[PDB]
Scaffold this motif. Structure first.
Motif, short mmCIF file in Angstrom:
data_model
loop_
_atom_site.label_atom_id
_atom_site.label_comp_id
_atom_site.label_asym_id
_atom_site.label_seq_id
_atom_site.Cartn_x
_atom_site.Cartn_y
_atom_site.Cartn_z
N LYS A 16 6.66 -49.03 -51.72
CA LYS A 16 7.03 -49.87 -52.85
C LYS A 16 6.00 -49.74 -53.97
CE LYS A 16 8.04 -53.76 -50.40
NZ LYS A 16 8.87 -53.44 -49.20
N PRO A 17 6.42 -49.88 -55.22
CA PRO A 17 5.45 -49.84 -56.32
C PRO A 17 4.48 -51.01 -56.23
CG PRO A 17 7.62 -50.53 -57.11
CD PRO A 17 7.81 -50.03 -55.71
N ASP A 37 6.46 -54.73 -60.67
CA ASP A 37 7.36 -54.34 -59.58
C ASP A 37 8.39 -53.31 -60.02
OD1 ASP A 37 6.61 -55.65 -57.09
OD2 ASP A 37 7.02 -57.54 -58.13
N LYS A 38 8.05 -52.48 -61.00
CA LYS A 38 8.90 -51.39 -61.45
C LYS A 38 8.29 -50.06 -61.03
CE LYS A 38 11.05 -53.49 -65.56
NZ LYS A 38 12.47 -53.24 -65.18
N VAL A 39 9.16 -49.12 -60.68
CA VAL A 39 8.73 -47.76 -60.35
C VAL A 39 8.40 -47.02 -61.64
CG1 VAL A 39 9.54 -45.54 -59.46
CG2 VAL A 39 9.93 -47.63 -58.14
N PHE A 68 17.24 -45.20 -60.16
CA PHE A 68 17.89 -45.82 -59.01
C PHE A 68 17.27 -47.18 -58.70
CE2 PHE A 68 18.23 -46.45 -54.38
CZ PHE A 68 19.61 -46.48 -54.25
N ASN A 69 15.96 -47.32 -58.91
CA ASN A 69 15.24 -48.56 -58.64
C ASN A 69 14.98 -49.37 -59.91
OD1 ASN A 69 14.12 -46.35 -56.49
ND2 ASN A 69 14.33 -48.39 -55.56
N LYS A 70 15.71 -49.08 -60.99
CA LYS A 70 15.57 -49.79 -62.26
C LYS A 70 14.13 -49.73 -62.78
CE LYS A 70 17.17 -53.87 -62.38
NZ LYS A 70 17.23 -55.20 -61.72
N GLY A 71 13.51 -48.56 -62.66
CA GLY A 71 12.17 -48.35 -63.15
C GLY A 71 12.12 -47.48 -64.39
#
Ligand SMILES: O=C(/C=C/c1cccs1)Nc1ncccn1
Ligand SMILES: [Zn+2]
Length: 573
Positions: A16-17, A37-39, A68-71
């Motif tokens: 996880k980021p 908490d963003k990639v 895909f992870n909204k980063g």
């Protein structure tokens, strides 16, 4: 259904980021407060050449995981090395990212950090973790054991002596190659990627973005990890070629008390029968074996785009392959099968005749006209793409290979004496009468067997002569090389060129309603339930269609209104 690659395998098991393994775990509070908490990923192409198909996996892995992870994903040009740096490389890279349906969160350059990198070279020197060497390239081979590794007298220079010499390098004191700045790592370590790597080389040349301000420029071993830390890269994804380099990667960050990004390596994409030597492909473009770096026979992105391949087909293909640490080995036939199955669903069907012969239906009057309505995609979604009308009359074209003047055999189902052929979406068949020689060309006279229900053995395509669009060139492309290992040819890879890799057809014709496909293009038909429905911009490459018995085609870069040029994307098969 369609299993996404980002929730499986290499990508689905990444951390996880904000939880990147650190030597100093307090360096995450400044890192966590930036990422939220963003990639954060990167794409770091070196702008000294065009992107080939392997970069599509690098683009999909990095922008796709971020999306895909909204980063967010950086588009970072790796212009560490200053050269001519032709602007077309920078544009082509931007275009190929945008063409694949990914938007960078921010476009950055490696040169943007030359100041901050110079400050960290001092901190490493002041930390007694680097030194200036005046060794020749032959000397360091002996110190590396070309064997037994020995140190150099420069490694034991005082810290103030390293500081004094480095400020000289900055001000253009020494010549190219005569002085370096080597990291003070570990010579007893068995990893060769840690035998005092060079961190700064003196070049004394202008950089396209910074000019003559810098007389010394760093190396890749110094730039990659530090610029990743500056941009708070949560996942620094590269190919397994640099797996041994991760030790020196993590070493330099732990030696400077900076945030340590997590470098996790994936296996690159290797297509069989491809040469990747940039010099070799350069030789082809210069001598004329191909007509540019974007030649549709190449596996460069510009060439694949000009070939007519849709971006979604590329992504759909990389996704079904998956991403693991194992390097692939995929036949190009599986790539063409993916593009074929993609176009089968997303392109309208048109009637085109590659080798036309004029037909005269004797028993029809000149004023005769039968409007025939044809759907663009016959099947479950007919009413979605629309219909078109072709006028069937006395004068049409069909293909030379669909009519023979002698009686047919067990393998020939088309027009012949005693064997009528059906015309697509035309009620009744045409029967053979005679072949007239006129103006060098051949003209087949037929009857329209009106009013007689008789099933033909096949239905062939046809074009109204009066409104037929005449095509200047149609280019039929095949594999550029005959073998799957051209560099292993006994006489060289040049002696393995496929002479039939490009066939130019000069006399083809197509129905008038191609003008309608150009107007609706870019069409961007979607595959239901698929996540890879990329919308494209205007351009001849987007004018795609299926020729009903020949294959899939698109308009080439060189096509104009009064001079159409078509590329055969892939065979019908
Ligand atoms: O397109 C390339 C290589 C392209 C590159 C672009 C920039 C550096 S290499 N190779 C290929 N090999 C066999 C058949 C077709 N294509
Ligand atoms: Zn030395």
């Amino acid at each position: 259904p369609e299993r996404s690659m980002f929730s499986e395998g290499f990508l689905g098991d990444l951390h996880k980021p904000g939880e990147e393994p650190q030597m100093y775990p307090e360096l995450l509070e400044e890192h966590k407060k930036f990422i939220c908490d963003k990639v954060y990923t990167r794409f770091p192409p070196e702008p000294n050449g065009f992107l080939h198909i392997g970069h599509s996996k690098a683009i999909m892995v990095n922008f796709g995981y971020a999306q895909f992870n909204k980063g967010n994903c950086y588009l970072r040009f790796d212009d560490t090395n200053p050269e001519a740096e032709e602007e077309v490389y920078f544009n082509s890279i931007k275009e190929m990212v945008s063409w694949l349906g990914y938007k960078p969160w921010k476009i950055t350059y490696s040169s943007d950090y030359f100041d901050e990198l110079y400050e960290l070279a001092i901190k490493l020197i002041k930390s007694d973790k680097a030194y200036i060497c005046h060794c020749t390239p032959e000397e360091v081979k002996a110190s590396r054991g070309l064997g037994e590794r020995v140190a150099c007298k420069h490694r034991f220079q005082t810290v103030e002596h390293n500081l004094r010499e480095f400020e000289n390098m900055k001000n253009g004191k020494y010549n190219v190659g005569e002085a370096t700045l080597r990291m003070k790592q570990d010579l007893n370590s068995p990893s060769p990627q840690m035998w005092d790597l060079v961190a700064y080389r003196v070049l004394n040349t202008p950089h396209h973005r910074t000019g003559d301000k810098w007389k010394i420029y760093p190396t890749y071993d110094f730039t990659h990890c530090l610029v990743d830390s500056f941009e708070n890269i949560t996942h620094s994804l590269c190919t397994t070629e640099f797996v041994l380099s991760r030790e020196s990667y993590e070493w330099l960050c732990d030696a400077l008390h900076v945030y340590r990004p997590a470098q996790r390596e994936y296996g690159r994409l290797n297509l069989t029968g491809t040469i990747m030597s940039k010099r070799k492909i350069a030789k082809l473009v210069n001598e004329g074996y191909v007509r540019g770096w974007d030649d549709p026979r190449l596996y460069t992105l510009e060439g694949i785009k000009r070939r007519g391949v849709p971006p979604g087909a590329i992504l759909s293909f990389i996704n079904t392959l998956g991403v693991t640490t194992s390097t692939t080995n995929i036949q190009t036939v599986r790539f063409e099968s993916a593009v074929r199955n993609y176009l089968d669903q997303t392109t309208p069907r048109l009637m085109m005749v590659l080798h036309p012969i004029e037909v005269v239906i004797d028993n029809l009057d000149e004023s005769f006209s039968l409007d025939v309505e044809i759907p663009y995609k016959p099947g479950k979604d007919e009413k979605s793409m629309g219909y078109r009308k072709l006028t069937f009359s006395k004068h049409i074209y069909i293909d030379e290979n669909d009519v023979r003047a002698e009686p047919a055999d067990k393998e020939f189902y088309r027009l012949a004496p005693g064997q009528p052929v059906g015309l697509m979406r035309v009620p009744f068949n045409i029967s053979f009468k005679s072949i007239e020689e006129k103006d060098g060309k051949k003209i087949v006279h037929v009857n329209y067997d009106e009013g007689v229900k008789a099933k033909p053995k096949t239905y062939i395509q046809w074009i109204p002569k009066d409104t037929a669009v005449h095509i200047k060139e149609v280019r039929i492309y095949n594999q550029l090389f005959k073998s799957e290992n051209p560099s292993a040819h006994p006489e060289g890879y040049l002696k393995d060129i496929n002479p039939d890799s490009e066939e130019v057809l000069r006399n083809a014709v197509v129905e008038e309603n191609l003008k309608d496909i150009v107007a609706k293009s870019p069409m961007n038909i979607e595959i239901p339930g698929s996540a890879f429905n990329i919308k494209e911009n205007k351009g001849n490459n987007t004018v795609r269609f299926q020729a009903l018995r020949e294959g899939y085609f698109c308009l080439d870069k060189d096509s104009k209104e009064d001079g159409l040029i078509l590329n055969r994307i892939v065979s019908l098969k």
